[PDB]
Structures are given as C-alpha cells and as structure tokens.
C-alpha cells in the first residue's frame, strides 16, 4: 500500500542545481517525518537530509550541508530535495525513505526507523553531452551455433548516459534473452550487448529485431538481425 | 560512524549473525540485493520486523550494539545488509558500510562463452568491435585474455566486472576495439576466458 515515487533525476550540470520530488501515497504524509538517502556508484547508503512533519525542523548530512534544501507539501503529498553547487561526489541513486513510526516517535535523522524505501532516482553530475547509441547487429553464425540453438544479438555502442533498454521483436520474444550490463569505456561512453538464443531451424524463416531505447537522447532503434553477410 | 563487518558466510539452512555498533540510539537493518535497487527493511527500531518479512529475520540491541540474526538461511538471503541509526554526536542519520552475506555450498560452474566478430555495418563506419559474452559462471571471477592470431593483444580491451544474473550465476562482457585494417590483417582473433584454472577459448575470423 505505501509507495514512495522519486522523480527529477538524470544528467545534471556540475556546479549547477537539481530538484528531486518524492510523491508519497498509501499513507497520510503529514503524520510522518521524512528523509532522503543516497548511494554513490560502488558505495554504501549515505543519509542526505530530513524534515519534521510540518517542515518546522530540517537537517542535512555533512556532504551536502550548505548546498541542500529539504521541503515538503503535505497537501500535495510530496517531499522535495534541492541540491546546488553540484559536484561529481553527488552522482548516485537518491531514495525517499519513510520512518515506520509517526512524527511523535521517529524523528527525521533516526536512520534505524526506516520501513519504506522509494524505487530511487539516478543522478549523474557531468558536463558531457547526451549521445544516442550506434546499434549494430550480431549475426547468428554456423561455427558459433550449438546443436540446434543459435545465438544472435545486438551491440549498443557508445551512448551516454545510462540507461538503455533492449527488447526483442517488440517485447514478444522474452525466453532466452540475455542483456548484459554495460561497460564504461575510457572515452566516457557506455556500450552493452543483448543476445537471444533461438532454434537454429528458425534462422531462414523467423525475423529477429532488437528494439533499443535510449530515453536520455530521445532515440529508439529497431535493428533487424539477419544471418551473416 | 557505524561499524559492521565487510563480509559474513552462512551454510544453506544454517544461522548467521551480523553486528553493528557506533550509535547509542536505535538500529535498523536494510537488505540490498543489487546497488541502485531499493533497499528492503528487514528490521527497524532494534527488533521490529515489517509485515512482509519472514520470521527467520530477528534483531537484538544489547547495550549499544545491534545483532541481526538470520535463522535457517535460504539462497535468496544473499545480499548486502546495511545497518542504520541516529548519530547522537553530529545530529543526522548514519549507516554502516554494509555486510555482504554469502550463502556457501554453491557448486562451481564453468563459463559459457559467445564471441562475435564486427558487423559489416560497423566496418563500413570505419570501426570494429569484437564482442565476448561470458555467462553462467560461479565463483564470480574470470580472467580474460585476447589474442591476434597467437599473439597477446596489448590495447583496446575493455572488460566489465562480473555481476550476478537472476539464476545466481555470474555474467561479464569483454570488448576488443580494433581498426578495420587490424581486423582484416590477421587470420583470426580469440577471446580466452579462464575460470578456476580451466579455459574456454572462442575464435573469430574475417569474412
């Protein structure tokens, strides 16, 4: 029943500012103190900011002190986190977090009282421009087939920032699909691959198309994957 | 700051304990199966368990130290467990560095390797990438070596760190960037994957 839904993430300007919004549902927001927690790539959870039930008192983690503003609108069922003078150290996933007990019992910095977490929103602090991927087919091959099963796929090259989603045959093909986590190249651009294992007998008759979506660059590519040529 | 161990191991069906110290206030325990994925509270306010959490998870604060206990460990319990509490000295929230729980007794599994040569389309764009896909291996460590004919490849290699798949086995990717000219000037290229002393090699050739 309780849901915390964060928005406002994505690519952000170094030295600039961001505004994250947590839309709370399935409970009366005004009965709770609230907090924000973040996680930098390859790091642990870090407490960011907290606010009392009516916004009377706010508190901030040392890493954001003097650059952050937590606010809430009980009427709209939202908690907002503004952060300015953005730095590389601010890149990570930001979560909205709800204490288990009411505002009389659990205060905003009581990180041991959390019962509900938001899905989280990704923040990337970088001046690098968005770049859509180049999508190439990975043709099924004879000296690369295994007993009536063949592997074919799509190479999603040189995009920025994450994420990319890949489906096969417009979502109709799910079994045997394996989309690999991206590599971050020395260039600062990502690349990933998605492979599908299909019956070898189907290669001459069944069309295979990978649907690659890169929402950051407003690009979608549907690449037909045909036997080698 | 909060202190919790880096790692802990438990046998399937057995018991495990994770301690956390550093706060004089109430502790919480938060499970995270993958970084960036929403944590799941297993214990809050020292010993309270949320409605959707199984009884096998228990918490106990004695003095200023919390102990998270899992009695009757299942494979799905494998995760990073973060402890959280109030920082009485500084005034905000604090978390421990996280404890990785490994469920022992998982059988060794050799990697499956799929290697693709550059597509005609990429070659027409004056680029060439060899794609080496490595999957279904356990434990989660592989060594990747590339060869141009029989010679080791010194540059243009980018490899991911292994990551756990939905089936509890690991996957990794390695990419070799070449010029179209280098690709066409060798009889073959090979991706060699070593896992627990045994190697799986795949080879591709220009066509």
């Amino acid at each position: 029943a309780v849901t915390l839904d964060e928005s406002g993430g994505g690519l952000q300007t170094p030295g600039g500012g961001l505004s994250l919004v947590c839309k709370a549902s399935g409970f009366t927001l005004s009965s709770y103190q609230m907090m924000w927690v973040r996680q930098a790539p390859g790091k642990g959870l870090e407490w960011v900011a907290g606010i009392t039930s009516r916004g009377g008192v706010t508190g901030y983690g040392s890493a954001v002190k003097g650059r952050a503003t937590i606010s809430r609108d009980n009427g709209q069922s939202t908690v907002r986190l503004q952060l300015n003078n953005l730095r590389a150290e601010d890149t990570g996933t930001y979560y909205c977090a709800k204490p288990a007990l009411d505002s009389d019992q659990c205060g905003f910095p009581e990180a041991g009282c959390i019962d509900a977490w938001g899905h989280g929103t990704e923040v990337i602090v970088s001046s690098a421009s968005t770049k859509g991927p180049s999508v190439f087919p990975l043709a099924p091959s004879s000296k690369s087939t295994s007993g009536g099963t063949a592997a074919l796929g799509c190479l999603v090259k040189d995009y920025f920032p994450e994420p990319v989603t890949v489906s096969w045959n417009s979502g109709a093909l799910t079994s045997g699909v394996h989309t690999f986590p991206a590599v971050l190249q020395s260039s600062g651009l990502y690349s990933l691959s998605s492979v599908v294992t299909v019956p070898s007998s189907s290669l001459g008759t069944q069309t295979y198309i990978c649907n690659v979506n890169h929402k950051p660059s407003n690009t979608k590519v549907d690449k037909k994957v045909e036997p080698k040529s | 700051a909060l202190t919790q161990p880096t790692s802990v191991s438990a046998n399937l069906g057995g018991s495990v304990e994770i301690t956390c110290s550093g706060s004089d206030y109430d502790y919480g325990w938060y499970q995270q199966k993958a970084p960036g994925s929403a944590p799941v509270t297993v214990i809050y306010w020292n010993d309270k368990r949320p409605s959707d959490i199984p009884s096998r998870f228990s918490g106990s604060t004695s003095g200023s130290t919390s102990t998270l206990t899992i009695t009757g460990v299942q494979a799905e319990d494998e995760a990073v467990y973060y402890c959280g509490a109030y920082d009485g000295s500084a005034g905000g929230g604090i978390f421990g560095a996280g404890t990785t729980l490994t469920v022992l007794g998982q059988p060794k599994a050799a990697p499956s390797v799929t290697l693709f040569p550059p597509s005609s389309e990429e070659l027409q764009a004056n680029k060439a990438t060899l794609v080496c896909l490595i999957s279904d291996f356990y434990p989660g460590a592989v060594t990747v070596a590339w060869k141009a004919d029989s010679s080791p490849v010194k540059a243009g290699v980018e490899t991911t760190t292994p990551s756990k798949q939905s089936n509890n086995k690991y996957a990794a990717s390695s990419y070799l960037s070449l010029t179209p000219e280098q690709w066409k000037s060798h009889r073959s290229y090979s991706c060699q994957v070593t896992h627990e002393g045994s190697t799986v090699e795949k080879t591709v050739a220009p066509t």
């Binding site: 103190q33 009392t52 009516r54 008192v57 007990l101 009389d104 019992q105 905003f108 910095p109 009581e110 | -």
Partner: peptide, 10 residues
Amino acid sequence: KVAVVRTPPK
C-alpha cells in the same frame, strides 16, 4: 518511543 527531534512547542 519519543522522536529525537520535532518542531519546538510555541
């Protein structure tokens, strides 16, 4: 349980 922080009564 008592919250460690709340708006001061005024």
